Design a protein around this ligand. Structure first.
Ligand SMILES: CC(=O)[C@H]1CC[C@H]2[C@@H]3CCC4=CC(=O)CC[C@]4(C)[C@H]3CC[C@]12C
Length: 233
């Protein structure tokens, strides 16, 4: 039973341990590193995904960590603030002022825009959950994965699970359209993230060992079009 397993393994609260732009960004990076810990424990108990060679699991996670965390940022903003603010952590909610101080003001707007989508679609917890798994399987290597045959079977099943959900019948295509749009939002998130990373030493913006670990060997798997985003439309 996919749905029941998905809600149970869903990670829980996590403090960021909370003011210039550099300190604000350093904080979110540390919070990111702490959230990626919950993402790793969550994925390892994920149906299907946990049976693919460990190499595919790690790769998929590195291609999609930004998706998963920002998408969650939305669920959280949706649930705790009716999408009115950015709920990164309990001790750190963002409003236009904050979004401004992080030197991240447009990027914030885009995420807040996803949240707004949630309240408008009246997104469901059951939908959210399956959708977060699909985001995990939203980007693959340009020429395919090791166990590609297995990958597609699993991905098709979760797509089927989302279908079982919505069955008005159009809501399906609405949620999968929303999923494709996430790609656009995350591609901008990463470009800015890749830049701050490259200048971290000069900008005084702290990045956790984990994020450094991921972003580092992610760039090579992306550059020269070595990555392939999967869309529904
Ligand atoms: C400083 C920086 O480049 C920013 C740009 C987009 C930002 C990320 C946006 C998505 C996100 C949501 C969270 O709830 C935790 C922190 C993260 C993972 C953010 C950490 C800081 C990033 C990587």
């Amino acid at each position: 039973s996919p749905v029941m397993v998905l809600e149970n393994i869903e990670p829980e609260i996590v403090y960021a341990g909370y003011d210039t732009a550099e300190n604000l960004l350093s904080t979110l990076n540390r919070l990111a590193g702490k959230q990626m810990i919950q993402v790793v424990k969550w994925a390892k108990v994920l149906p299907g995904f946990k049976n693919l060679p460990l190499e595919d699991q790690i790769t998929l996670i590195q291609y999609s960590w930004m998706c998963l965390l920002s998408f969650a940022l939305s669920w959280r903003s949706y649930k705790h603030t009716n999408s009115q603010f950015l709920y990164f952590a309990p001790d750190l909610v963002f409003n236009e002022e904050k979004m401004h101080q992080s030197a991240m003001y447009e990027l914030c707007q885009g995420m807040h825009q996803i949240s707004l989508q949630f309240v408008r679609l009246q997104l469901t917890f059951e939908e959210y959950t399956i959708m977060k798994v699909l985001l995990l399987l939203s980007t693959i290597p340009k020429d395919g994965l090791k166990s590609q045959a297995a990958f597609e079977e699993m991905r098709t099943n979760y797509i089927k699970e989302l279908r079982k959900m919505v069955t008005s019948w159009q809501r399906f295509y609405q949620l999968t359209k929303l999923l494709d749009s996430m790609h656009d939002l995350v591609s901008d998130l990463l470009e800015f993230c890749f830049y701050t990373f490259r200048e971290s030493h000069a900008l005084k913006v702290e990045f956790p060992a984990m994020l450094v670990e991921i972003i580092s060997d992610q760039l090579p798997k992306v550059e020269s079009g070595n990555a392939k985003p999967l869309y529904f439309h």
